[PDB]
Ligand binder design. Structure first.
Ligand SMILES: NC(=O)c1ccc[n+]([C@@H]2O[C@H](COP(=O)([O-])OP(=O)(O)OC[C@H]3O[C@@H](n4cnc5c(N)ncnc54)[C@@H](O)[C@@H]3O)[C@@H](O)[C@H]2O)c1
Ligand SMILES: NC(=O)c1ccc[n+]([C@@H]2O[C@H](COP(=O)([O-])OP(=O)(O)OC[C@H]3O[C@@H](n4cnc5c(N)ncnc54)[C@H](O)[C@@H]3O)[C@@H](O)[C@H]2O)c1
Ligand SMILES: O=P(O)(O)OC[C@H]1C[C@@H](O)[C@H](O)[C@@H](O)[C@@H]1O
Ligand SMILES: C=C1C[C@@H](O)[C@H](O)[C@@H](O)[C@@H]1O
Ligand SMILES: O=S([O-])[O-]
Ligand SMILES: O=S([O-])[O-]
Ligand SMILES: [Co+2]
Ligand SMILES: [Co+2]
Lengths: 367, 360
């Protein structure tokens, strides 16, 4: 399957299916690019990297560039070293950067590619379900400073995306689960019949076929791009993709790598639902709909939540990776819903002011 | 004097005149920014930096960040250090970065600003005539890699530009000359029968009044923006502003700091003219016209072609088919030579080499 993705007038083909890469030659013009610089963080399996390199190798010479994985090395310094090594390989304006990995590699490679010669071709090969169904459906690129996550970056589209659903289907279930959390976020925030699966197709093991993941990817493409095609910077209606993220991101920091992003977000959406209900915005049945879908993917079942309430609050009021978290002394802005499919508006924005009372309460009581 | 500059849909006011910073409260609202991080490389006279801090302070807290100047330190690593320090000072989405310096400070602060929170306000206070009349009239931002110049960057527009013509009138004459070379380049590449100055107004000592510099800046705004307003990435008709730069960049490298960028460009334009002549595009008179105008500004005076042709040609072939290199050429003054729907004309490497050998 091939979908045409467009962020305003910046379009790319997102091909996804089994052995898409062995069909790369059908998607990229024979002499589009004179060289492939393949970029992959050190945690990506070598078998995926070497496999991708052999197929890109049918079009033009490929070089493989690894770098040290982990959020500690997701920095402009890692980017510079990759750009230097690329130039030392003879990279030029006709080179494409092929990012082979999850979202960490996507971001690092996207910052590299968006700056080299003021911007060269970026091709995504997402190897995690979260990268394939969420993070490559965003043109934000960012890396970390010592004082914060994703503090430096910009907006930069790819030229191509290839998601191999056989690779995704063999990925770790805890990682599939993480991207399934964001998929269930998409189900709760936006009205849909434009999905070719039901809640019956969700399972709590997070083990899916290549074809089921293909169908999930298609739904995420439709869902996200229905909003981001027009809101490319994710500053308006695109705030909706931050449902569950306000508290979720703080919990994610507090747990210091103990929980996945998707798990933190799943918990963050449960909190948002309870808050919207405690504010009279959302009926109880809609809150129960959050628990019902999240349990279907086994989201809340695991979840080694080890941090204290005060540490979660600390991370929340000291956070800068989104603008306008703390409105005034008493209130944080949150993306809340009046119901499944129904974002709550406040003053022509998706940020509803929420009293710190309710936030501390839901955090302390947990699940 | 204020001109609205528009890169497509991204506009800013460019204010320029004497003691222009004294009137800052007339351009930027009070509410607008919570804070000003004023960045300047170590080579910028401290008096200018403190002077600018003083007037921005009338609006909001200003913190000054200095960084080691020079092309060797114009890197992403300097940018990161500047960003981290700005974060340590409480920089946020409502902070403006104020770049006080020449094109080097502009580019370093430009990249810094373009990346923080994925883009905060950039404010230029250009203190060299080159920056005021050329580099601030481009949304190109870039820094260096080990392997070469300006290899990493992006396009990012500023929110305001303030050029104090008094400061510029007192900058070193060799620095003024460098920006006058790009002005001459504008004269040579665009047709304009309605300039507010003539060739008689150009001098070789490169000493001008504040008002004369304001007139040159205005000329440069009209000239570049007549093309760049539409061609924002400088990839189409905006390639014209690279006239003299193909051999220029390489001369500038070969000389190792010994000549300015305008001087290198000046020489690169003469070689481009000779080239277009040997290729039957340019009459001999237009070639002399290049020499004539550049000698008006003393462009060829402090020039040491301390270099052999071979050093120049090597940097040229290492600069990012096999017998040709593309050049912007002209058929005559004000007359860009088109080739196959583009401003890039293939030129034989062996021809380039022989013109360089022959010299001025
Ligand atoms: N990347 C681009 O598209 C682009 C375009 C134009 C310029 N630039 C960069 O700018 C540099 C050249 O620009 P420039 O001529 O403005 O010089 P510059 O910024 O390199 O300045 C040269 C020297 O002037 C000092 N200086 C600044 N203001 C002064 C003043 N008022 N009086 C005395 N000294 C002063 C220093 O900062 C410095 O030691 C190059 O590195 C060039 O790449 C880049
Ligand atoms: N661009 C955006 O809008 C955007 C969106 C969401 C997330 N992100 C970024 O993505 C990162 C998280 O992304 P992620 O969840 O994809 O994980 P990740 O990139 O952090 O990868 C997680 C781990 O899985 C490895 N890995 C990758 N593919 C694998 C596979 N098939 N099998 C086994 N291991 C594999 C990695 O090397 C790694 O150690 C963060 O840096 C985040 O901010 C960016
Ligand atoms: O950083 P680059 O791509 O080398 O571009 C710089 C040029 C950009 C252009 O707008 C200006 O007219 C030129 O003098 C200037 O040298
Ligand atoms: C920050 C983002 C960008 C947005 O596009 C995604 O849905 C989110 O899940 C992701 O965390
Ligand atoms: O976490 S959210 O729903 O603002
Ligand atoms: O130097 S230019 O004329 O390509
Ligand atoms: Co998320
Ligand atoms: Co120039």
């Amino acid at each position: 399957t091939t979908k045409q993705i467009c962020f305003a007038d910046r379009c790319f083909n997102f091909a996804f299916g089994e052995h898409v890469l062995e069909s790369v030659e059908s998607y990229i013009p024979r002499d589009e690019f004179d060289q492939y610089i393949m970029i992959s963080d050190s945690g990506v399996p070598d078998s995926i990297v070497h496999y991708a390199a052999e197929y890109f190798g049918k079009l033009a010479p490929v070089h493989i560039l690894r770098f040290q994985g982990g959020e500690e090395y997701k920095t402009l310094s890692t980017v510079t070293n990759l750009q230097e090594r690329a130039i030392a390989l003879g990279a030029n304006r006709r080179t494409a950067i092929v990012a082979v990995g999850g979202g960490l590699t996507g971001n690092v490679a996207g910052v590299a590619a968006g700056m080299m010669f003021r911007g060269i071709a970026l091709i995504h090969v997402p190897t995690t379900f979260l990268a394939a169904s969420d993070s490559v459906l965003s043109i934000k690129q960012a890396v970390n400073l010592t004082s914060g996550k994703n503090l430096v970056g910009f907006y930069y589209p790819p030229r191509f995306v290839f998601a191999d659903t056989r690779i995704l289907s063999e990925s770790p279930p805890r990682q599939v689960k993480a991207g399934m959390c964001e998929l269930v976020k998409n189900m709760l925030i936006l009205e849909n019949d434009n999905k070719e699966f039901t809640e019956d197709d969700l399972n709590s093991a997070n083990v899916y076929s290549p074809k089921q993941l293909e169908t999930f990817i298609n739904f995420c493409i439709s869902a996200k791009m229905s909003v981001l095609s027009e809101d490319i910077y994710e500053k308006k209606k695109g705030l909706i993709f931050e449902y569950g993220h306000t508290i979720g991101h703080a919990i994610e920091l507090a747990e210091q790598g103990g929980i996945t992003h998707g798990e933190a977000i799943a918990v963050g959406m449960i909190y948002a639902a309870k808050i919207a209900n405690r504010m009279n915005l959302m009926p109880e049945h809609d809150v129960s709909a959050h628990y019902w879908l999240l349990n279907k993917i086994g989201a809340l079942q695991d979840i080694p939540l080890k941090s204290d309430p005060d540490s979660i609050f600390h991370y929340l009021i000291h956070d800068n990776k989104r603008g306008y978290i703390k409105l005034d002394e008493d209130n944080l802005g949150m993306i809340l819903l009046s119901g499944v499919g129904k974002p709550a508006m406040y003053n022509q924005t998706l940020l509803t002011p929420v009293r710190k009372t309710l936030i501390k309460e839901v955090i302390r009581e947990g699940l």
